Amino acid sequence: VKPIFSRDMNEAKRRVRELYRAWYREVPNTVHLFQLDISVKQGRDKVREMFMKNAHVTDPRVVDLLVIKGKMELEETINVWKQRTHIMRFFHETEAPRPTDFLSKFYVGHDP
Amino acid sequence: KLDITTLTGVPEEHIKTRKVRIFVPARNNMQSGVNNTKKWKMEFDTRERWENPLMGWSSTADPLSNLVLTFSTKEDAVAFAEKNGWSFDVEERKVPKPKSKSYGANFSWNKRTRVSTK
Amino acid sequence: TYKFVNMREPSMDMKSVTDRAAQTLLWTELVRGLGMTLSYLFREPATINYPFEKGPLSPRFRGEHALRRYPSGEERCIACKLCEAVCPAQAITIEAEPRADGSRRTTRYDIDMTKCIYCGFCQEACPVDAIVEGPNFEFSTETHEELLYNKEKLLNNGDKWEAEIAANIQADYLYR
Amino acid sequence: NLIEVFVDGQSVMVEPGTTVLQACEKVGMQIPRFCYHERLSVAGNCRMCLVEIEKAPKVVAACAMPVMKGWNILTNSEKSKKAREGVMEFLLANHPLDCPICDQGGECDLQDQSMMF
Amino acid sequence: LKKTTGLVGLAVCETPHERLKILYTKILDVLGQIPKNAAYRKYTEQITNEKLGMVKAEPDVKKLEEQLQGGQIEEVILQAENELSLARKMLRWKPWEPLVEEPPANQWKWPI
Amino acid sequence: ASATRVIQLLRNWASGRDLQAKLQLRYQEISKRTQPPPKLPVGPSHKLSNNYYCTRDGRREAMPPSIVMSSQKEKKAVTPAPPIKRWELSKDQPYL
Amino acid sequence: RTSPTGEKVTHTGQAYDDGDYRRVRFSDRQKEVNENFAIDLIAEQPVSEVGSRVISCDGGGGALGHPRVYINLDKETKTGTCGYCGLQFRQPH
Amino acid sequence: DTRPTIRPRNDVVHKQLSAFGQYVAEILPKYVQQVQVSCFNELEIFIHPDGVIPVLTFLRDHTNAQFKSLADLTAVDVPTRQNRFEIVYNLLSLRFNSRIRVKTYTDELTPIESSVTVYKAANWYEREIWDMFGVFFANHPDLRRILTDYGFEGHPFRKDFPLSGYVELRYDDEVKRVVAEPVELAQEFRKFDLNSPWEAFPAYRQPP
């Protein structure tokens, strides 16, 4: 199939690393500009966590699309198009912890 | 294999815990029309529908409780379910048997098909 | 079949040039607009003394909903549920059971005025003129919950505005 | 054994003794019907399934009439349309205005067939 | 001469006939660089020859505009420029070649 | 309007027009708010004969779009339509 | 009528039980209850007598009522009841 | 038929559009796959997805096709196809007073050449197609969210996207900000099964 930006996973992994460097070097500015009440480590760990969620992906086309969406998210953060509400949406705080144990799920509700 | 799950934006709870059913809807027994039993349909699994305290309306926390996708063939539905990482459950289409019907049998001479009233 | 706005050259006659210079220096068009708004000053204002004076309305006005009753006193609603089916905002919720007499009477008829689009499709679909958007439009509430009307709220509304609702129906039903 | 009949010109191979309604169902045409049921004996009294056979001057009842080889069934011809409209008009002549109060409403064969034919 | 073309951004050309002839000759050359059996070359050559003959036939600007039915002569010049650019691009695209690929099965079937 | 002659003259001079003629406020020229009952006419299909729906079913006389060319198994150049005729200048007020 | 808790009962029979927290919404406020139970209002209407074997009721007013329906009056044990109106009719006996 | 209820049919425009469709198909056989003229006189040309720029540039610059105005640019999601997304181009020709349609197809991954170089209006239309459906347009000057929320995830106009979405907003007093939470509805959207079991139009009957 026709590629999007890369023809090999190695080429696709290169763009992921480039995005990570841009994201990693942006977190100190994001905390400073948005006046976040978190630490630089928390944001950088959060960036790592979101990258690690899409770690099982093997199709280079999907990898390119994820980086394309990754750059779009970074542009909003750099340009302060996002707000403190948008930035802190990754750090789910109002959401109560949902246990993943069967017995805990059994006690709560009919959730399969 | 297509793994668009990371691009659809669906949360993880509604990708793995779900159970998509692929079937041709059964004919509404109240009617003889069969136009609805021609296209394959895809629906999710029913979940909790509690009662709203204020008005008694049936509340829900299932965002996929109203999704009914229509497909031309079974293979397309299976492919679409595989694209989004949904555990599909295909039910084979049931077609009514060809039946031998004879109006003359209503007045049979030596058979039980002879009717007593018209 | 078409017209040219602008596209009008000015005459360069010495009289016309002098008139244009006088307009530029003495601000003739500015004084013209000043006179226009001064004339508007001495007009009679179009304000109405609300709430003592109310703006014009028509018998077709779509306002607060109400469930009407037959002259006999019984509800017209026979729970056909097509007013709920036609409602584009899905604001109507209807549940029905065979009443003690055996008639088709709703047990729940709930419309959230906070979701309704005041389209009228409900009053136009009802085959017995039961649900009818009445003439009331000033029913603002201090809380959100008051806008989630029950069957009791609608029935009460209908009994209050019946005289007017009937009169409006009588005035308009020939167009429907 | 399969004889050949035509539904709107299209060829179709059917068994001997097959009714017109089944021949039309084979190609995908569902002739309107009230009295006919697949699991009941053929009655032929509702007269809604009347269809025009090409070159024939009379409209047969598809629910009862068995096909003959070479027949061309004109499901959507003008004779069939007029027969369906007349039968629906006769059915609805004495039918009560209970649609709002009738529980069959919204899933009524008489309503849908009146809307369509 | 015409004071203005009416349209904003379109300037009056003091030499319409010469410009039209030059543009049409350039278009004809670029079409001559195209294979003969191609339908684009044949159709565009026919149109350009008709327009060039009409230009050579009538020296009057307004009568030429009425005969061309392309609006004002400056619009005709712009159309000729666009046609020349299109011919140059089609020289690279080469659309006279057979179909790239047939639609996949039921790709243009409606309804579902 | 309930405006004195002096006020009306001042208003007309300041505006430069006769405002008392085309008053914006409505006093009596409006239609009555209690109109007589109407009687609307029936359409062209309200007849008891020669009115079969098959002869007037526009919704069922539509057809699937006609396929003109499918890749699946000297002509003159053709425009999508005749070129648009040049518009003509208005004869009421050609130049505003 | 009044529920044992002291709360008026609606025409549908709904009344919050004493062991129901939802009754607290009526503490400083009222419970909206219609005081014109339709079932009581229709039964008040008398049964009209018509000599004909089949009559038709439109709810009164013509186009301002309900779809016209025809009611059989053959059963002498019962009275024909309009589906929409609820009015009762009886053939003289 | 005739009489007031039916809509009059104009054969002249039908013939003209069919002729122009044949013309376009002859000129561009490399990309044109199918040509149709609907009964209400609307011309559609079906183009292989690689033919976006060539066919549109031809329809914009050709002397016999001056579709210099991009009326619309939308996508249709049909999840029953391999290429579910169907990109539709609506063009207007002020010179010949007619309109034409160009339809291509694309997957959830295969990109489409951006027609910004052809029509400058295609910019925001392609941005909206990307935002709503997920179709990526290559060589696009600025592709990003145009209609959805800034931190929105998912493409809503897809047929498999839920009507109410997956997340909802509210103001929390603890965090002093608007927070996104999984969607919970006080009343569920009552899905209606409205399709009649009887065939309505015999002229569109698909083969068994």
Ligand code: SF4
């Ligand atoms: S209000 Fe009218 S339309 Fe709605 S359920 Fe009652 S009778 Fe039917």
Ligand code: SF4
């Ligand atoms: S006015 Fe419209 S939106 Fe409101 S209840 Fe009636 S039909 Fe529904």
Ligand code: FES
């Ligand atoms: S279906 Fe009734 S006569 Fe055949």
